[PDB]
Amino acid sequence: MKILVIEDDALLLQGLILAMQSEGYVCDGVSTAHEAALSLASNHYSLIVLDLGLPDEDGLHFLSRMRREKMTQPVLILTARDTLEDRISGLDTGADDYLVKPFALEELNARIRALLRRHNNQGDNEISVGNLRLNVTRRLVWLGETALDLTPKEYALLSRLMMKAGSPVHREILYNDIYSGDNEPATNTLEVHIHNLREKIGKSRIRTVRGFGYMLANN
Amino acid sequence: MKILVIEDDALLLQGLILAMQSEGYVCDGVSTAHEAALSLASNHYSLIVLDLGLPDEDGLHFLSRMRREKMTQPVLILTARDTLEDRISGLDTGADDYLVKPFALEELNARIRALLRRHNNQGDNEISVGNLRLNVTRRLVWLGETALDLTPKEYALLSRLMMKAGSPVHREILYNDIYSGDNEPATNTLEVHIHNLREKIGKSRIRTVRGFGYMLANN
Amino acid sequence: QDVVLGLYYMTRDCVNAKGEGMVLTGPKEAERLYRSGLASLHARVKVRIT
Amino acid sequence: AREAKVLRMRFGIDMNTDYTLEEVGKQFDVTRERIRQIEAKALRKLRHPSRSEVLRSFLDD
Amino acid sequence: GVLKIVKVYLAVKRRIQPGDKMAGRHGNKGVISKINPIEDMPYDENGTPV
Amino acid sequence: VTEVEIDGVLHEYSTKEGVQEDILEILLNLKGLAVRVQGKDEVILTLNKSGIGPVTAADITHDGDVEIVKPQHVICHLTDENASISMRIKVQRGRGYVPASTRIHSEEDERPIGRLLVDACYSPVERIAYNVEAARVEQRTDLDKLVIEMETNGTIDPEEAIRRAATILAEQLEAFVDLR
Amino acid sequence: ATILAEQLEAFVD
Amino acid sequence: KPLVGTGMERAVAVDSGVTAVAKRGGVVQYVDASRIVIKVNEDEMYPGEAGIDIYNLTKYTRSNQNTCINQMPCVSLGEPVERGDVLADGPSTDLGELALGQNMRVAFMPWNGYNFEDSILVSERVVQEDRFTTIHIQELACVSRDTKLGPEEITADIPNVGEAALSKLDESGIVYIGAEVTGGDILVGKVTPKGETQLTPEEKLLRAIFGEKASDVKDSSLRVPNGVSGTVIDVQVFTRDGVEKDKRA
Amino acid sequence: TEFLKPRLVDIEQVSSTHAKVTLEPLERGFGHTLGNALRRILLSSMPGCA
């Protein structure tokens, strides 16, 4: 993963570069925040290492700047600062994890893995049939541009139908999904709900397999 | 943001619980890891202060089981095992941050704040939705440029709504988020809290989605 | 069928075999003599029995 | 007592029929959603792990 | 009415145990009664067991 | 030998291209591998060979403290010039006969699909007989002498075998000597 | 047991 | 082989077609665990054709009785062969002679009642040597059918089952080849559409307290019959002409 | 490799001079080794005056 190494000492720089490269991480080890900002603006990074005892300006200034343009990436703050007040200062400033000098290499590589796995593995599921999209986790329906607005009952039906893209869903499945655990009134509740939904997603989108429920057309 | 702290020693438990409740998070405490699993099963938690000194089975297997059970909640370890190899082992098992005893309360709170921010607020320290601007780390809400006096509960609700910007949040999620497992009321409270939040912020921001909780509008 | 052949082989006799005509003080040293290998399983003998 | 009775009549555990919210509201002579609140409270506290551990196990059979 | 069929082919490896019928070419059946430890089998004069 | 693992082989009921035997015959040829592990308690040998010819136990890349006492024990046969076999043979130490089923029942750990499981016949002694001849002593003429003929896989030294047997017997008799 | 133990002691080492 | 036979074993083995007999003479070109390529002699060779006989031995295959029909080359690379010579043993042949069982040291004598009334007392050196160990191939089939509640689906996602059992299924819901299964393990994940399940008021209360309504899809997954272990060695998928093939197909 | 050290469970003194000694458990095939070695020694090598 892409690494921005920021430290003053040349030997320490070499050491970290060697270490993370051997672990198979692309390294960009530099010293000035100017070069670091240029690199950030050029290349997408995953994790960024920083020292607060920076020659130019100060580490906290660079951190705060990165906060301003919304650089929401793990910043493993590798510093010499030891005061607990300084540590809180760093953390609330925007620092994620804090390792004082000296450290052991394996400790640092472990912290790095944790931070990266944290900022990744955050996927959102999306069921997109034709132009109708469904962000299931977000309960957010999208007809093209306009985010479609649906009643509780109607959303559920659309959910089931899109999950089974093109598959005729037996009307019993929907009839139970609507009234989950409750009894059903003897009226054509499912039919009229389907009518309302049809009008919203565009009339004649859900078909009607006579006898055997309904089917949301894949195309 | 409800935080589960499962730590064995009673005095430490009460101290940590009062610390969090002072911070603003309501938090529940459990000792037996079996009870911990049950509580995590019924409710929705956000952060876990996992202690490895369990009287039932050492935390590390609990970590492994939950991570196989797809627990995305960050875990901050509060333990005494300072052996470098063991710290790394905990991290690799899934410990996001690892706090070694003797700890500091303010240090613990800062670590937690950092964790919560990176996971839910996607690493950012400022939520910017229209004229609302929320510094979650500083507990500060800014309507336009002026400051607002927000009660604990309303702050919690607003925090959660703004973090999940645009996407409706379930009623039960909110109900857990403001109400600690122990003190669960008998009547309409979430609605009144949303009403006062809307009175201090304006009826436009908090849109009502019948059946599935509420939504902060981004558009 | 196998038990009956065992009983028949053990409760049988021979003209002249190991331990031919010694006197034994009971059944227990008859067993001791057989196990020790000093007298054959079926060899005519005088034993005191009660 | 009151929670138990209303809970029973609602779902029907060992009861004649499953009196709906309206019916049970009639039974205790309250024409409101006091019953709904009551049922919410009851269901709520029977998820609390210390109160229901044995019962929770049958669910995930 | 059949959309798709999946056929899975296990392959068990069965070993001798008490109960497995064995026989010979001369009409002498038999149900194995005991898997006797090696050191208990009757052994020849060169210590080769049976 | 307790577990085997050949490259690109998923189960033992398969075959390999260029190899004259089925992976089952290779596992039966491996059961009868006579190794002697000097220091440790569980070692993992590696066999790599390519080309026409017999793959014998002399082709196992030997650890320092692992001795193969019969290096002509044909593991397998390769019949194609482009053929190649690469395999990692796990050798354990124990006593008795432990079948693979007993192990896998006692093991809840999920091995990868590809780790073939050989049955384990640990005990080195194959055949053993004895004769009680009469010894020669100046006055005692009723003394005997015991001649024990051992036949083994070549992994146990006879004297050490008898020392272990006498030790086991003495350890067991302690219950009767120091009775209750 | 003491008799057999003694015979095996001579060759247990 | 039987140490004592009647000389008729060779005929019963070669005339069953369980072995691979050479069609024409020649010198073996390439022996493998699963094919024998034999290069025919010059004179036995018809003028227009290449003169190469290829025998594809049939590896582990179920018989009608759930036994193993396996063939094993009994020749060596580059060695001469004539017409009628056995090139590959069968399930129960040995160098061309029938061999239905194995010969071992029998002693006729009673043993402490373990051979009473036709009982057999077998040593353990016979079990250690795996000489009466038999391979039993078995077939299990899962059919996906069109019901009145909808088509049945073969898929990994199975309700009321953890990742433990699903560890061995691949993505499409069908076991990997080589997976050592034991009684109860899921072999393919098939779930059928399910409808309104009339539950008792008490289940109503239970699902309305812990807020857990069961899915509308019941599981009918194929699983290993109880008491059986084994190693999945082959999976065959059959699909209609007109149904999309899942990933593993 | 300390094998299985047993526990003398029953000392049934039936008489002042007749006893049953029950001793469990032993590694499989050690009951016979110990029992026979003892039995042989007791029968044919214990010293006494007669």
Short mmCIF file of N, CA, C and O in Angstrom, two decimals, chain H residues 140 158 161 184-188 219-226:
data_model
loop_
_atom_site.label_atom_id
_atom_site.label_comp_id
_atom_site.label_asym_id
_atom_site.label_seq_id
_atom_site.Cartn_x
_atom_site.Cartn_y
_atom_site.Cartn_z
N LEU H 140 -24.51 -38.96 -4.73
CA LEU H 140 -25.57 -38.20 -4.11
C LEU H 140 -26.00 -37.12 -5.08
O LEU H 140 -25.15 -36.51 -5.74
N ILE H 158 -27.58 -19.89 3.02
CA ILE H 158 -28.55 -20.82 3.57
C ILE H 158 -29.02 -20.26 4.91
O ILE H 158 -28.19 -20.00 5.78
N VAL H 161 -27.98 -21.21 9.26
CA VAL H 161 -26.73 -21.95 9.21
C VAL H 161 -25.58 -20.94 9.24
O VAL H 161 -25.62 -19.93 8.53
N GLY H 184 -23.68 -35.18 7.90
CA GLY H 184 -24.28 -33.93 8.29
C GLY H 184 -23.74 -32.72 7.56
O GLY H 184 -24.42 -31.69 7.53
N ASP H 185 -22.56 -32.81 6.96
CA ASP H 185 -22.01 -31.67 6.23
C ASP H 185 -22.85 -31.37 5.01
O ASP H 185 -23.34 -32.28 4.34
N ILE H 186 -23.02 -30.09 4.71
CA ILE H 186 -23.81 -29.66 3.56
C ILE H 186 -23.00 -29.88 2.29
O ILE H 186 -21.82 -29.53 2.22
N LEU H 187 -23.63 -30.48 1.28
CA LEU H 187 -22.96 -30.76 0.02
C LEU H 187 -23.31 -29.77 -1.08
O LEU H 187 -22.43 -29.35 -1.81
N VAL H 188 -24.58 -29.42 -1.24
CA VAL H 188 -24.96 -28.28 -2.06
C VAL H 188 -26.02 -27.51 -1.30
O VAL H 188 -26.86 -28.11 -0.62
N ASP H 219 -34.78 -24.20 3.74
CA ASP H 219 -33.59 -24.88 3.26
C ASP H 219 -33.88 -26.35 3.02
O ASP H 219 -34.47 -27.02 3.87
N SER H 220 -33.48 -26.84 1.86
CA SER H 220 -33.58 -28.25 1.52
C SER H 220 -32.25 -28.73 0.98
O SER H 220 -32.18 -29.52 0.03
N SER H 221 -31.17 -28.25 1.59
CA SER H 221 -29.83 -28.50 1.08
C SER H 221 -29.48 -29.98 1.18
O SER H 221 -29.87 -30.67 2.12
N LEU H 222 -28.76 -30.47 0.18
CA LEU H 222 -28.27 -31.84 0.20
C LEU H 222 -27.11 -31.95 1.17
O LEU H 222 -26.16 -31.16 1.11
N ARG H 223 -27.17 -32.93 2.06
CA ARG H 223 -26.11 -33.13 3.02
C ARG H 223 -25.77 -34.61 3.10
O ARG H 223 -26.58 -35.47 2.76
N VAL H 224 -24.55 -34.89 3.54
CA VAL H 224 -24.05 -36.27 3.59
C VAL H 224 -24.94 -37.09 4.50
O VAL H 224 -25.26 -36.65 5.62
N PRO H 225 -25.37 -38.29 4.10
CA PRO H 225 -26.21 -39.10 4.98
C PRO H 225 -25.46 -39.47 6.24
O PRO H 225 -24.24 -39.65 6.23
N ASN H 226 -26.21 -39.58 7.34
CA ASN H 226 -25.59 -39.71 8.65
C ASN H 226 -24.78 -40.99 8.71
O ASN H 226 -25.08 -41.99 8.05
#
